Design a protein around this nucleic acid. Structure first.
Ligand SMILES: [Mg+2]
Ligand SMILES: [Mg+2]
Ligand SMILES: [Mg+2]
Ligand SMILES: [Mg+2]
Ligand SMILES: [Mg+2]
Ligand SMILES: [Mg+2]
Ligand SMILES: [Mg+2]
Ligand SMILES: [Mg+2]
Ligand SMILES: [Mg+2]
Ligand SMILES: [Mg+2]
Ligand SMILES: [Mg+2]
Ligand SMILES: [Mg+2]
Ligand SMILES: [Mg+2]
Ligand SMILES: [Mg+2]
Ligand SMILES: [Mg+2]
Ligand SMILES: [Mg+2]
Ligand SMILES: [Mg+2]
Ligand SMILES: [Mg+2]
Ligand SMILES: [Mg+2]
Ligand SMILES: [Mg+2]
Ligand SMILES: [Mg+2]
Ligand SMILES: [Mg+2]
Ligand SMILES: [Mg+2]
Ligand SMILES: [Mg+2]
Ligand SMILES: [Mg+2]
Ligand SMILES: [Mg+2]
Ligand SMILES: [Mg+2]
Ligand SMILES: [Mg+2]
Ligand SMILES: [Mg+2]
Ligand SMILES: [Mg+2]
Ligand SMILES: [Mg+2]
Ligand SMILES: [Mg+2]
Ligand SMILES: [Mg+2]
Ligand SMILES: [Mg+2]
Ligand SMILES: [Mg+2]
Ligand SMILES: [Mg+2]
Ligand SMILES: [Mg+2]
Ligand SMILES: [Mg+2]
Ligand SMILES: [Mg+2]
Ligand SMILES: [Mg+2]
Ligand SMILES: [Mg+2]
Ligand SMILES: [Mg+2]
Ligand SMILES: [Mg+2]
Ligand SMILES: [Mg+2]
Ligand SMILES: [Mg+2]
Ligand SMILES: [Mg+2]
Ligand SMILES: [Mg+2]
Ligand SMILES: [Mg+2]
Ligand SMILES: [Mg+2]
Ligand SMILES: [Mg+2]
Ligand SMILES: [Mg+2]
Ligand SMILES: [Mg+2]
Ligand SMILES: [Mg+2]
Ligand SMILES: [Mg+2]
Lengths: 46, 18, 93, 271
RNA sequence: AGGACCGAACCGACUAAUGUUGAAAAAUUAGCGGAUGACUUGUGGCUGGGGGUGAAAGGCCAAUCAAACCGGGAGAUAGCU
RNA sequence: GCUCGCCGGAAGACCAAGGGUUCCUGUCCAACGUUAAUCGGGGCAGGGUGAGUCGACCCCUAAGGCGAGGCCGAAAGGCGUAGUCGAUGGGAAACAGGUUAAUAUUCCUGUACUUGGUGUUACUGCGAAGGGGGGACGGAGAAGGCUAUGUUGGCCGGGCGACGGUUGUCCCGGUUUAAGCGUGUAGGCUGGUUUUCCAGGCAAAUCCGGAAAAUCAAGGCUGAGGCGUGAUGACGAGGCACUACGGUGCUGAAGCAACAAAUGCCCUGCUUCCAGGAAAAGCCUCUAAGCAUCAGGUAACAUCAAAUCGUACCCCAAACCGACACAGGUGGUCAGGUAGAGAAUACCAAGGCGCUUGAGAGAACUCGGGUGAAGGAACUAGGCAAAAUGGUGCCGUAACUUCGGGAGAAGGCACGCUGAUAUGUAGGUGAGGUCCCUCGCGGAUGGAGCUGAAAUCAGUCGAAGAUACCAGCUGGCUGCAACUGUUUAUUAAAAACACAGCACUGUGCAAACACGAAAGUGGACGUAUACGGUGUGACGCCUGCCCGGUGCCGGAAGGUUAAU
């Protein structure tokens, strides 16, 4: 049966990519939180 | 060499009303 | 393409595979490892000047590095660019 | 002509079509076309602000000359074309200098007729004149409210207004709603009735026809749950609540007009 | 001509059996309904939580919904176990 | 390696998305594989994707996003103009053959094509952020002309049959060739050519659109396909020699015609219908300002340049989404033979596989099946289930009806094979030949040769001729909903929801209303023959009385009454 995750790189980058996150301050606050936590992968972009 | 565990659980049965 | 300084860093190493050996015998084409950022043009100029040989055409491809493991640690080989440089008929290296 | 189809299949039994052989069967005049993207009844916030809108066949908009300011230039009707954006039919007119435009087709208009606009035009169907120069009691349509703004009143098929009186710079008009209204005498109007008067005789006949018009199904509030609509539901079919609207405003009689800026022009409201 | 007929692809999911620590966190087999249309589908897009969307079942909104998810107030409070 | 079995509108082949080295070779068997494993999509080490013409990218825009200034908003921010992004759409160009363990429209051979830059030469009105044309568009249906492709015959090569016959009307295989270039065919569309005038196309315009007049019986545009060329080539059954079972090298016959035939092409056509069916740029053309010696334009040569990025492999699956090497899910392209209406179905071709434990035994019981004496729903909440019906042609077909239906109503008859009518029928296709041509891919005759139903009569076997697979059970009364449709993804598909229709009511357009602190947007680029809300729910006959209560509408004299 069709599961929930149907991958698509273009949709994936346009939704959660670095430039989509940084477009707004709230997304920029996500980067600030992940930088503070020390995440190896900041965003979903490859 | 990297085993793990997972459990979600589901709920269903019959009636107990008499 | 015209600067002698740029050209001297374009060629990295020759390729010594079985395919390269066949290229020497059959179609007079040399397989080289070049800088990842290099363009077909400049490569033609560098080989023509540093080897005194006439080049017909140069086709390039990008080899993706392999993912390996050193013990229990993940790792990746570097990407590199492979150039197939076809020499004009008669000339040999 | 109004023709009823024989009931050779359910969904065709009650369809009644209005067929006018005089309408042009070819393609529209290309230079007058522009995109008209659908909205789905959704505003710039993306929310539905008017329900029961969505889908339907794609339609292109025809630029209709609602101003009629080519004064003194006679025009001849080349053909009548169907317009999906309105119930009335439109007329492609050709002026004597070569200009083409789309106009509303009045009742008696036909190919080869001659129309004229301006203060010195004759009072004849299809002619546009300032309404100060039209005899009282005449029947007109596509009536402008403000000088140069364009016609806005009585534009749908078969509609018209009556000039019942003239007094100084104002006239009193009886609109299709029956209200008597004052409009500036310098406003223009087109003589005659709007064509396609048989439009009320058509029967679409089936749900698919309304879907072709971009009309989505309407669900009665009494069929909903209390969380969704004030009429809510209840076991079986229960009502017991003075009629309302999806947002609590009382329907079935409560008046909602509150302008205070245009009432000065209403000498008698409709009844 | 047809929200026409029959019936594959395709969409749907009415009956029964099997499955119920499954082949499977809703399936398979034999049947069944629609099948030029209010059809179906690909790729993008828009609507965000007392809000959305809903041919309306309190349905759906990432195996979740009479108020999603994540973090915080927070060691809420718990005359109860 | 030889058999056997399964799929073959897939369980084959090629892709997109997604994955990311799983691809190929060597080597190894700890772990991984639901068993062993010498094997593997496992471990290790090397190798492997080559693009002016394939995509991405680039130019162009859709929905939509962002958005200088701007408008709005406690702040954050929201909306939005000019703009700038954004394909799932529009824009220049490559084909065949060969070759690697793994790549190939990317590599070699052969033969092509496109767009720019530069130079030379000749002839020369050019030129926009402007204007026009074009690009440019729906659904359904009907044929006709074609090709892919198949069949048969001919031709070429091989064969004379592990047991009856097989020099024969016999058996097997092959009979292949592209883009490009030339011709412009079937056919579709449109009257054409000059001169003249003109408040229009934001100015101008020689263009477009107009008015008149003249003259021509034609001209132009589009477009399949075929044919020729490409091609004295390539490919080609097979052959002999060598050799590491590979292979390598050389040679290499015929390479035609008829018929049938698409869901593919002419066709973005034609016809018809209402629900009335993108944009922009490239491209063509027209002139402004600014140059008119110049620049620039056109044409012919020569010449440069066409970068960068993807390119292995899987892709209905063991490589993607499902924790699994999970009986699930996943868009596009390709469409062989016999039977058949068919992409159903059965058996097969090319090709790919036998589903990662098996071996015995042949108990109960369970699952999936097969058959059944006599009876035939007595079973059972309930004919659930199972069984039965099932095709084509023809005959025949009721109440009722909105005259369409009901209806495939029910019910019945005939179906194989052989011969004859007729050594293949009617039909379809149509060569040669013979006339005619202002002459060609021509027209008219002509009928050879191929292809081919269907019927009747006679005979003939079977217990059964729609013999398998495939493939309606039917009828009567009645409740409910008119109908098609929608719904509780995952215990409810209904009488529930929707529905056309009907009525009431609001709404005069800075509309009502709705989303928004607001700007604004939707309603609608609509205007009462319109839109919103409510209830009812085709159609037919109809919808009685009550305004006291509660709402709503109208009135405004009086009583009462806030801030002030
Ligand atoms: Mg490349
Ligand atoms: Mg409505
Ligand atoms: Mg209604
Ligand atoms: Mg309910
Ligand atoms: Mg709600
Ligand atoms: Mg409520
Ligand atoms: Mg009740
Ligand atoms: Mg139907
Ligand atoms: Mg049916
Ligand atoms: Mg099945
Ligand atoms: Mg079916
Ligand atoms: Mg059906
Ligand atoms: Mg859920
Ligand atoms: Mg709450
Ligand atoms: Mg606690
Ligand atoms: Mg606290
Ligand atoms: Mg088989
Ligand atoms: Mg087949
Ligand atoms: Mg099949
Ligand atoms: Mg990929
Ligand atoms: Mg690996
Ligand atoms: Mg392998
Ligand atoms: Mg093991
Ligand atoms: Mg491996
Ligand atoms: Mg700003
Ligand atoms: Mg595309
Ligand atoms: Mg090359
Ligand atoms: Mg052929
Ligand atoms: Mg013998
Ligand atoms: Mg079709
Ligand atoms: Mg490949
Ligand atoms: Mg391969
Ligand atoms: Mg699987
Ligand atoms: Mg398995
Ligand atoms: Mg047994
Ligand atoms: Mg028996
Ligand atoms: Mg037996
Ligand atoms: Mg018995
Ligand atoms: Mg018996
Ligand atoms: Mg009985
Ligand atoms: Mg009993
Ligand atoms: Mg009984
Ligand atoms: Mg039953
Ligand atoms: Mg059965
Ligand atoms: Mg059946
Ligand atoms: Mg009863
Ligand atoms: Mg129903
Ligand atoms: Mg009823
Ligand atoms: Mg739906
Ligand atoms: Mg359910
Ligand atoms: Mg459903
Ligand atoms: Mg169900
Ligand atoms: Mg009802
Ligand atoms: Mg009553």
């Amino acid at each position: 049966m069709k599961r929930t995750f149907q991958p698509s790189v273009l949709k994936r980058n346009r939704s959660h990519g670095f430039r989509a996150r940084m477009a707004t301050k709230n997304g920029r606050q996500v980067l600030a939180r992940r930088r503070a936590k020390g995440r190896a992968r900041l965003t979903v972009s490859k | 060499x990297x085993x793990x565990x997972x459990x979600x659980x589901x709920x269903x049965x019959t009636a107990s009303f008499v | 393409m015209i600067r002698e300084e740029r050209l001297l860093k374009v060629l990295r190493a020759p390729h010594v595979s079985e395919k390269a050996s066949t290229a020497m015998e059959k179609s007079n084409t040399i397989v080289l490892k070049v800088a990842k950022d290099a363009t077909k043009a400049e490569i033609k100029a560098a080989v023509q000047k540093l080897f005194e040989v006439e080049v017909e055409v140069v086709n390039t491809l990008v080899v993706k590095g392999k993912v390996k493991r050193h013990g229990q640690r993940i790792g990746r080989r570097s990407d590199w660019k492979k150039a197939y440089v076809t020499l004009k008929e008669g000339q040999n290296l | 002509a109004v023709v009823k189809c024989k009931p050779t299949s359910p969904g065709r039994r009650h369809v009644v079509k209005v067929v006018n052989p005089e309408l042009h069967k070819g393609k529209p005049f290309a230079p007058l076309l522009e995109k008209n993207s659908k909205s789905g009844g959704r505003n710039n916030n993306g929310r539905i602000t008017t329900r029961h809108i969505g889908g339907g066949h794609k339609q292109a908009y025809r630029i209709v000359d609602f101003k009629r300011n080519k004064d003194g230039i006679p025009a001849v009707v080349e053909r009548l074309e169907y317009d999906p954006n309105r119930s009335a039919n439109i007329a492609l007119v050709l002026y004597k200098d070569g200009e083409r435009r789309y106009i509303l087709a009045p009742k008696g208009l036909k190919a080869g007729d001659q129309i004229q606009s301006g203060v010195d035009a004759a009072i004849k169907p299809g002619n546009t004149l300032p309404m100060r120069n039209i005899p009282v009691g005449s029947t007109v349509h596509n009536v402008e409210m403000k000088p140069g703004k364009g016609g806005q009143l009585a534009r749908s098929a078969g509609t018209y207004v009556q000039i019942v009186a003239r007094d100084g710079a104002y006239v009193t008009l009886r609109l299709r709603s029956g209200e008597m209204r004052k409009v500036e005498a310098d406003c223009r109007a087109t003589l005659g009735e709007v064509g396609n008067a048989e439009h009320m005789l058509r029967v679409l006949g089936k749900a698919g026809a309304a879907r072709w018009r971009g009309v989505r199904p309407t669900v009665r509030g009494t069929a909903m749950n209390p969380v969704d609509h004030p009429h809510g539901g209840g076991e079986g079919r229960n009502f017991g609540k003075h009629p309302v609207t999806p947002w609590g405003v009382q329907t079935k009689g409560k008046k909602t007009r509150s302008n205070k800026r245009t009432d000065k022009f209403i000498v008698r409201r409709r009844s």
